Amino acid sequence: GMTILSDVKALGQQIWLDNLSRSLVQSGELAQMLKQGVCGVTSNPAIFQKAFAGDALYADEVAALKRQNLSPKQRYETMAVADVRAACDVCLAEHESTGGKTGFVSLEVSPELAKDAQGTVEEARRLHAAIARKNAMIKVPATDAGIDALETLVSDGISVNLTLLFSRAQTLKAYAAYARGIAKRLAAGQSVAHIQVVASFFISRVDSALDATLPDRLKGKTAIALAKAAYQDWEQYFTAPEFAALEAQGANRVQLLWASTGVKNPAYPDTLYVDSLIGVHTVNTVPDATLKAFIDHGTAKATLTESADEARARLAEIAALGIDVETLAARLQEDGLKQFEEAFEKLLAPLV
């Protein structure tokens, strides 16, 4: 039942909606969700491509914007920024109630900037200013350039959702960049207590890549094992003396956010990823249908840290089979960027 969302909050995990559209906000639905336990919203170019194509409330907005001398990208941005600002307003009471720890809405920079650190910083600063809300996160792919940009953006006081993480090594690099940005601000006497960063670590895509060629005992297990190990890494990094010295001064830990948590293989229960990844100081962003399924027949239990030994043994067998999860992660990130760019080009074409 619906109270499962509150039960998960009590276990220390926020559940965000991995969807955004003009009607979601305008209908009052998002406001009702933010009372029923949903704690935030994520978007990406594919989410906007589908929303722009299917939501009737965009038609008049597009017709209005086609009367102006604007590029397709600025037409898209005007639409998307408006949706994000409206969603931020709906989530503000939640955000403020926790001291700025919840109630975020994420907007991703253009995929074509993913390997351009300076361009990413420039666009992220601009979109942060354009949205003009304290509870907006700018979403930045965790390429090497994105981690460079993360350090700068954090030092600028901007909250960031670092996305397309599939690698424990790259995630640790992100934590180090975050800490450098925080340390810069503290050295300069600037505030840090309102800077929030999430590390969006993707789940289903790992199993989709590997399952058809894995042995029985491993099918449907790798993505969860990888996430469990990532969370163990998180505990070790953020409790270490180095970060404790920053947290003592008001720094917030980065939080892991489980993304791509809709189940894509009908051989697995539809709540598999949500049920299996609940732990303290995390987020799970879920598509509508997965949110539905979890409310109907999900289970709220602190599963993320259970059986970490088995997760390690599974990852050791993955390596024994010759699957290099770091090579895989780089490919999956590359593939995700290609897919997001494809979606972005698809949504721009009707805005010409």
Numbering used by the authors: 0 to 351
Authors' own words:
In the redox-sensitive enzyme transaldolase from Neisseria gonorrhoeae, the side chains of neighboring residues Lys 8 and Cys 38 at the protein surface form an NOS cross-link under oxidizing conditions that leads to a loss of enzymatic activity through ‘structural crosstalk’ with the active site. Under reducing conditions, the cross-link is disengaged, and enzymatic activity is restored. In the previously reported redox-sensitive transaldolase, the NOS bridge functions as an allosteric switch that changes the structure of the protein, including that of the active site, and thereby regulates enzymatic activity. We have recently reported the discovery of an allosteric lysine–cysteine redox switch with a covalent NOS bridge that regulates the enzymatic activity in response to changing redox conditions.
In the transaldolase protein crystals we analyzed, the NOS bridge exhibits almost full occupancy, and our system may therefore be regarded as a best-case scenario (also considering the low B-factors). To test the impact of high-energy synchrotron radiation on the NOS bridge in protein crystals, which is known to promote photochemical reactions of redox-sensitive groups, we conducted dose-dependent experiments depositing doses between 0.27 and 5.4 MGy in 0.27-MGy increments (X-ray crystallographic statistics in Supplementary Table 1).
